[PDB]
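Quick one - inputs below.
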Amino acid sequence: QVQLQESGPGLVKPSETLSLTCAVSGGSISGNYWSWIRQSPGKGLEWIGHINDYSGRTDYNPSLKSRVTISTDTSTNQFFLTLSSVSAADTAVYYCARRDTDFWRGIYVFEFWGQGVLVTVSS
Amino acid sequence: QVQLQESGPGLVKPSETLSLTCAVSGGSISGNYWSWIRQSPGKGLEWIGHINDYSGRTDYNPSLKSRVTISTDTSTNQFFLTLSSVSAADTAVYYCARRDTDFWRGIYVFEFWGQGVLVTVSS
Amino acid sequence: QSVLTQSPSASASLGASVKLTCTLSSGLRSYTIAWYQRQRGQAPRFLLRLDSVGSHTKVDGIPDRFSGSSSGTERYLTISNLQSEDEADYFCQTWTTGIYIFGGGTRLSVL
Amino acid sequence: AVGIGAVFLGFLGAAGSTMGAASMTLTVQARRAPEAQQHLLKLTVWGIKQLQARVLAVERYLRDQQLLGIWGCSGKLICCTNVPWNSSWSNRNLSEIWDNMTWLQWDKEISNYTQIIYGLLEESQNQQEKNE
Amino acid sequence: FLGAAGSTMGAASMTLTVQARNLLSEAQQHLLKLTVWGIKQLQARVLAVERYLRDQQLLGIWGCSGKLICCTNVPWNSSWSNRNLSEIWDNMTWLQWDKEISNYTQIIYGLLEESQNQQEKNE
Amino acid sequence: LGFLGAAGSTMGAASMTLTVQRAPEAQQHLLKLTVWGIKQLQARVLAVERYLRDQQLLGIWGCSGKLICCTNVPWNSSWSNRNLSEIWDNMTWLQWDKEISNYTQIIYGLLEESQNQQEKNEQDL
Amino acid sequence: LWVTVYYGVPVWKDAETTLFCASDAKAYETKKHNVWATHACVPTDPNPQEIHLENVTEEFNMWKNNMVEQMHTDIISLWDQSLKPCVKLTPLCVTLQCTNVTNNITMRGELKNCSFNMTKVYSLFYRLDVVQINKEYRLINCNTSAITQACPKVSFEPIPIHYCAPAGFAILKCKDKKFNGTGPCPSVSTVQCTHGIKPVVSTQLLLNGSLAEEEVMIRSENITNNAKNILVQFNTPVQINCTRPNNNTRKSIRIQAFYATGDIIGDIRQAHCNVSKATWNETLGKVVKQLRKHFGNNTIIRFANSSGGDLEVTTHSFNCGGEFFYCNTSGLFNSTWISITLPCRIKQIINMWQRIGQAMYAPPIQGVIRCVSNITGLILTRDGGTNSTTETFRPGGGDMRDNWRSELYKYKVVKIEPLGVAPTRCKRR
Amino acid sequence: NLWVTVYYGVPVWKDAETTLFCASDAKAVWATHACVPTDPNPQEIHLENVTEEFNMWKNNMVEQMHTDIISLWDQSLKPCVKLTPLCVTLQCTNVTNMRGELKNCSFNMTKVYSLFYRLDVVQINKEYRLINCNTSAITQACPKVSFEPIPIHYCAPAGFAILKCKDKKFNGTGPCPSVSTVQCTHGIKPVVSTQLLLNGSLAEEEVMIRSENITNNAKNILVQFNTPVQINCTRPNNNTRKSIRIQAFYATGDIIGDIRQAHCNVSKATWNETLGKVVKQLRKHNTIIRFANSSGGDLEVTTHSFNCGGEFFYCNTSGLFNSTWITLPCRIKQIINMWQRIGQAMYAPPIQGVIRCVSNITGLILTRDGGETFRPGGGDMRDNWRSELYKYKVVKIEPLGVAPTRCKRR
Ligand SMILES: *[C@@H]1O[C@H](CO)[C@@H](O[C@@H]2O[C@H](CO)[C@@H](O[C@@H]3O[C@H](CO[C@H]4O[C@H](CO)[C@@H](O)[C@H](O)[C@@H]4O)[C@@H](O)[C@H](O[C@H]4O[C@H](CO)[C@@H](O)[C@H](O)[C@@H]4O)[C@@H]3O)[C@H](O)[C@H]2NC(C)=O)[C@H](O)[C@H]1NC(C)=O
Ligand SMILES: *[C@@H]1O[C@H](CO)[C@@H](O[C@@H]2O[C@H](CO)[C@@H](O[C@@H]3O[C@H](CO)[C@@H](O)[C@H](O[C@H]4O[C@H](CO)[C@@H](O)[C@H](O)[C@@H]4O)[C@@H]3O)[C@H](O)[C@H]2NC(C)=O)[C@H](O)[C@H]1NC(C)=O
Ligand SMILES: *[C@@H]1O[C@H](CO)[C@@H](O[C@@H]2O[C@H](CO)[C@@H](O[C@@H]3O[C@H](CO)[C@@H](O)[C@H](O[C@H]4O[C@H](CO)[C@@H](O)[C@H](O)[C@@H]4O)[C@@H]3O)[C@H](O)[C@H]2NC(C)=O)[C@H](O)[C@H]1NC(C)=O
Ligand SMILES: *[C@@H]1O[C@H](CO)[C@@H](O[C@@H]2O[C@H](CO)[C@@H](O[C@@H]3O[C@H](CO[C@H]4O[C@H](CO)[C@@H](O)[C@H](O)[C@@H]4O)[C@@H](O)[C@H](O)[C@@H]3O)[C@H](O)[C@H]2NC(C)=O)[C@H](O)[C@H]1NC(C)=O
Ligand SMILES: *[C@@H]1O[C@H](CO)[C@@H](O[C@@H]2O[C@H](CO)[C@@H](O[C@@H]3O[C@H](CO)[C@@H](O)[C@H](O)[C@@H]3O)[C@H](O)[C@H]2NC(C)=O)[C@H](O)[C@H]1NC(C)=O
Ligand SMILES: *[C@@H]1O[C@H](CO)[C@@H](O[C@@H]2O[C@H](CO)[C@@H](O[C@@H]3O[C@H](CO)[C@@H](O)[C@H](O)[C@@H]3O)[C@H](O)[C@H]2NC(C)=O)[C@H](O)[C@H]1NC(C)=O
Ligand SMILES: *[C@@H]1O[C@H](CO)[C@@H](O[C@@H]2O[C@H](CO)[C@@H](O)[C@H](O)[C@H]2NC(C)=O)[C@H](O)[C@H]1NC(C)=O
Ligand SMILES: *[C@@H]1O[C@H](CO)[C@@H](O[C@@H]2O[C@H](CO)[C@@H](O)[C@H](O)[C@H]2NC(C)=O)[C@H](O)[C@H]1NC(C)=O
Ligand SMILES: *[C@@H]1O[C@H](CO)[C@@H](O[C@@H]2O[C@H](CO)[C@@H](O)[C@H](O)[C@H]2NC(C)=O)[C@H](O)[C@H]1NC(C)=O
Ligand SMILES: *[C@@H]1O[C@H](CO)[C@@H](O)[C@H](O)[C@H]1NC(C)=O
Ligand SMILES: *[C@@H]1O[C@H](CO)[C@@H](O)[C@H](O)[C@H]1NC(C)=O
Ligand SMILES: *[C@@H]1O[C@H](CO)[C@@H](O)[C@H](O)[C@H]1NC(C)=O
Ligand SMILES: *[C@@H]1O[C@H](CO)[C@@H](O)[C@H](O)[C@H]1NC(C)=O
Ligand SMILES: *[C@@H]1O[C@H](CO)[C@@H](O)[C@H](O)[C@H]1NC(C)=O
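Output:
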């Protein structure tokens, strides 16, 4: 059983870095895939990125590869999202989730999800 | 004071491997040439092969190059002949001898010989 | 080619002189040889090296009665003061290339 | 292949053996490449790597020896101390621990209290040397 | 690492273990840079280990053999800054003590070696 | 290596002596320098490993560190009995080792047994 | 009594530490130059320090192992490092005018001869590789992908790789032939360097795999749970002979020397693999026997072909001679049990390791490409489930770590801590 | 009532075998790729008052060097081309445009003629064949690699030291008063020769003579000179390389210019003086000291077989040894089997133009006679390599020591 707690500023001005921090408890010692997903209001969900907290190699959505950066620290056992150059359309509910390693016939699913932190951009 | 002793099967069937073991006492630690020779009944002797105890550079008679294999065991300080595809024409008295290390006027001699061991092939 | 020849058998009475002839081929006109004796049922013994000029290399522990000489492509092994132990098989061997050439074996008996 | 790692594998040489048998085994155990093509420089790199592996082995061994020397043990393989063993640590008698269980099970039962054991050992050695 | 380097004599003497443990811590041209870097790093660690071992050997010459708080039999001559033992042990930091003793270290080492050897030989 | 200078001297002198005891990348012929550096660090690491094994032997003989260690097994008669003065005054260490080389295994075995017995009967009381 | 320390004591602690690679001496020394699978790794010792232990039982768990993740990460980094020096194909992303070739029909050819105006130059591509745009065609991922082509000199082939624990660690190895890979292992040996591991990419099948002694083995973290995969290790390797019956030529078009496929010599036919029917039937019999043993005799075992999803998992993806075949197994697993020529195609744009990052472009291979391989391991995904009716085992896989876990199923990395203490009747004077 | 005491730190060493790796100077001739470069600071620590008895006839460094030389030869020869298809009947005829010697032979391969030497081919009973084509798988040397001897130092690995003897009065065996410790060795030259040592090291003081046991007239006698006897030796023939494709086989075409046997001279006065010093030396250890020529044996021991610029000369050396107390007609053959092996044989592809090599003569190999006549001999390559390795001995340092002193511990 893995528990997720996401945190970060609830109000962010336009056109600066947006920082989110998600702390995980009960995860596996290595080989985890910590993924960041978001859902914009009045729109469907969309994947942001994922980190292999053992290898350290990242991966991001192709349309957001220039604005995001995901890091992870094992000692405190957390992982951070930094979405720089935020725009007006990036207001959304952000979730930090963990995707499995079963790969049941060409799928990776995120079994464990965070509560869902609001991020609103306004002046 | 170098003494050579030989042992092995006395009777061997056609079409298998004949293995003969020769042990040495008093020989030098390294640099020696251990030679295997044989004499068929009613015929003159002929050289089978030899091994350099230090390097391991084997050498065999050209008429028996594709059938024999000579190896050494430095830990117990012995050396083995393995003659494959033995026939009824290979019955002979087998000797294990030590090669000279002087080369006096273009000769390598066999200063020390073994007592000779009989090997026969019969139906 | 390259081959050694010698008498198949020779004999003499005890206390006499025995001559052993080792014959080299045409291409072996001057090669050195080595003499080997083998008493029946024992380890063959090194006797001596001997070249075409008459030089011979005595071996420690070999009786001084053994002697040798050379004449062209003929090598002579002379034995004097015989006993029953000298009855054996003798042969001359040589090294031309990294292949050895042994004699056909000569049985010497003493009566 | 050579160095101190072989010594560590020799320490591993008998894991399931008896405690006394393990201690006796510990006491007993205390004692031209062909270079075909572009192999010289790769051999230099491999030499750097092998030297660093051997140095890692040596440093781990030296750290263990220094930890042993912090207490009253210097460098002896087997060592005797002067801090009492309270009954809280495995109150049951010593015949079963010293005859039946292998070192693995003893380590599993002690790993919870190994830190306080080390602290008591170091404090006892410090006190013994200060008083003397 | 240095820890209580500047603290009073007593605290440093009680916290010796910290310093004791801290003291023992392709493409052609790219390959040459790599091997020079490896040479530098390996030389650094090997020299550190050898200096630690030399210090351990010096301790072994005396009656220490790896023990931190050693104890010898050499009498303390008054010529080496004779003062009150408590005053020396609660006022001056290690640095000033060694600075004002660095003129007599060699004679102390020689006396220690001679006393240990005499104790070994007499008994 | 390094301590070969004292060789050929008297055991008294040898014992006394042993008691007392940024490169850039513009250097020409770089490959020779780096290879011989590899060799020198090989030598130094083998030196420290040999020292560690020798110290382990000294520890199992009840000496731990130290250089002039003393023990309790008596000198047997068969081990080339000679007058101590000429043993320790004229000949050299190499010759002495060549003389006692046949017996060093027995020496080590007796030394280990003596130290083990000393530990046993010291922990006895 | 008192407490005594014992330096030099056999102790174990399950801890994870980075391991260094070890290439076999003959792997690199003999002939291999400029191949990814071998690099500056330290050559292994001539003979491993394999010491057999007695009366020891250690707990193994491959599904919580760490060597598999470590080796997967090493393979990822090695593959990226191999691909880095090669020149990118970014300028190639442009509209292409394509017409499909009708020189020969096998099962249509599906190839497309496409012209691109690189200031009209022709090239040959495959249908899966290029997608129509609305005739005009475009590379499948050139818009939002940093597409790249492999270096012409380098070649893709498995090469043995050993893993040696650093000083202070050990590799516990379960020598038990009958070992499903979980819980206690009766016979535990210890090594410094592991046996030969060949990094091979494959789905639904294990090629160059390590045959398992005794009988066929079935492994899973949870047979009952549907989600967890199932590894099947045969005892008798199955021959497979697969060949692409075509020959191509490489045209050097400068963008940076891009290599494009040329016209095919003579006939054009889709690739085919061959497997003997009787050996396949016998191996399937052993597999279903073992699965019934894990499921009861009365259980009914059924098979089916892939259930879909992407294309690298439905089919059997594998590289041969430098060409990446995606060869279907639609017909191999079509048989209902109670108590073969594989036609297949190629895709020159591949997404290795299932990431949306850089995709590598397969260089053309001149001449007929044929290869023999050792089908030794199967990856099965249990059917859903309604109970006590039957079971279906359509092949799955795709997760490369699952492929690695078959070779590293019998190793664990352990930290030795020879500083144990003990109580005894001994007091220091 | 004495007691053992351990004395860790004592400078005790013992002789012990090992595996010296290599050391070279040339760029990675010999294969040389397994040879590390050599630009160290050779630490020549001269020990004091150290008498360490040496030996030369029982070194295990010599066999190690011989094995290294054989391995380098085989490795260099390996990537070359086999001459198996050459095993065909040769239609040979004499050439006139040391009278007969060379023979022109046509062969049919699918029909071209080339030049061969009389001692290189043997007739069959007009029609000739190679000397040993089927018994030994002949392989021809690659043209790019020569046979010039590159200096090859031997260094001891970590933990071992090499002991030099700087004493001039030294016959190899017996105690050596002056000794020094080193890690590398001097520039030993792997020259192949018989009866003459060719470019080896020069001994100081007077000429030196040495053997295992002189009295025993079987042990080879090595003599090291003081003043080298200059020998310049040529092959006065405009040889023409000819390439024939079967895989590129090389042979000799028609000779440009006149055909003359390869011959060379020796400074008569210097040779006489050096031989006089030698014969003065042999009087030790007043009878007749003859000097005959090589008594029988194969071509590798009868003549002064030696390489020169890729061409192998087997030279008549009777003239050099006839003074009882100078031009030498050097025969030429191109087939060759080295180190007295079988199944391996080289072809020595011809070199165009005229070759002339100027070299010293530094050592002599002589054998006693029964009964003197010190006729030359040799061929045991170890005897040749014992003329430079006679002042080296791999030694392992053993610091630990035990001594009987008066102590009681506790
Ligand atoms: C694994 O095994 C399953 C069988 O269990 C295979 O599934 C069949 O796949 C074939 C193609 O190989 C399918 O044939 C296709 O049918 C589509 C639907 O039309 C018919 O079939 C359905 C039932 O599926 C009926 O209800 C309907 O009345 C029709 O009879 C067609 O649209 C397809 O046409 C398209 O593809 C073909 C071939 O490329 C083109 O020529 C056409 O122009 C068009 O593009 C095709 O005819 C069959 O229906 C499938 N059956 C099932 C049960 O799924 C899998 O293919 C096999 N492999 C994998 C990877 O799953
Ligand atoms: C070493 O020195 C010795 C003596 O100092 C020397 O011996 C001489 O050798 C020559 C050459 O063989 C002998 O000359 C022979 O004379 C007889 C007389 O009939 C000839 O028949 C011989 O001819 C045969 O050999 C020729 C080759 O040399 C063939 O071409 C010919 O067809 C025959 O087969 C031959 O000419 C001479 O008699 C001896 N002298 C003595 C005193 O023995 C020897 O040559 C020197 N060199 C060596 C050994 O390499
Ligand atoms: C003993 O020492 C002497 C000198 O101390 C030494 O003599 C050297 O011999 C070599 C071999 O002939 C000479 O090198 C050759 O010299 C000629 C004429 O100068 C050149 O034409 C040659 O050029 C060749 O170089 C290419 C690459 O190496 C070859 O592939 C090609 O075939 C060319 O022909 C070549 O340099 C050298 O000049 C002399 N040295 C002196 C000072 O005279 C002798 O070889 C040593 N060993 C023996 C056994 O004598
Ligand atoms: C399981 O092991 C098999 C061992 O044979 C593997 O087969 C080999 O696969 C490798 C690539 O991983 C091939 O290497 C390339 O092959 C192509 C074509 O092969 C033909 O040419 C080579 C070279 O002359 C020759 O050796 C083959 O026999 C074929 O004639 C070559 O063009 C490349 O140069 C390169 O060699 C092997 O050739 C191929 N051997 C065969 C025929 O099986 C098999 O791939 C392994 N399983 C997997 C998929 O990992
Ligand atoms: C090379 O020179 C050395 C000396 O520099 C020679 O060593 C000498 O060898 C002889 C034996 O052949 C030694 O004689 C010995 O005498 C003692 C007492 O008489 C006796 O007990 C021994 O059995 C032995 O016969 C002699 O002492 C020794 N020289 C020295 C200075 O110790 C060596 O013989 C020379 N080698 C050659 C080939 O000339
Ligand atoms: C040094 O070289 C000489 C030259 O041959 C060797 O001398 C010979 O050694 C043999 C021993 O193998 C002697 O044979 C025996 O001699 C004893 C008397 O000492 C005698 O009782 C025996 O019956 C037997 O004949 C031989 O006499 C002696 N001298 C000669 C042949 O002239 C010596 O062995 C060589 N030294 C070494 C260490 O190799
Ligand atoms: C493999 O078989 C072993 C048999 O011991 C399994 O180990 C235990 O199996 C029992 C059922 O027989 C379970 O109740 C235990 O929980 C298992 N313990 C362990 C070690 O997990 C092991 O689980 C099996 N592994 C698989 C499923 O491959
Ligand atoms: C080596 O040289 C000697 C002397 O130069 C050769 O002996 C001569 O041979 C010729 C040819 O028959 C005779 O005419 C001479 O009379 C011989 N010389 C003497 C002094 O008698 C010897 O033949 C040469 N070696 C070879 C193998 O030919
Ligand atoms: C012959 O040997 C000498 C060694 O004595 C070689 O070296 C020369 O020795 C003389 C004598 O002291 C020196 O003056 C020269 O400087 C040395 N070098 C040279 C290149 O002459 C000499 O080289 C050898 N002969 C040949 C042809 O190499
Ligand atoms: C490329 O992909 C992006 C989304 O990442 C999309 O917005 C854009 O329209 C695409 N362009 C092309 C050439 O398909
Ligand atoms: C592909 O080939 C078929 C013939 O098999 C043809 O009918 C079709 O028009 C071709 N496609 C295009 C885009 O030309
Ligand atoms: C693969 O299968 C063949 C079948 O003959 C077998 O010989 C071989 O050993 C197997 N494995 C290898 C090493 O290719
Ligand atoms: C080589 O050929 C010759 C003649 O052609 C023959 O006499 C000889 O026996 C052959 N060698 C072998 C080893 O058969
Ligand atoms: C020695 O031999 C040579 C060559 O065979 C000859 O010229 C000379 O006359 C002979 N006699 C001597 C040098 O006294």
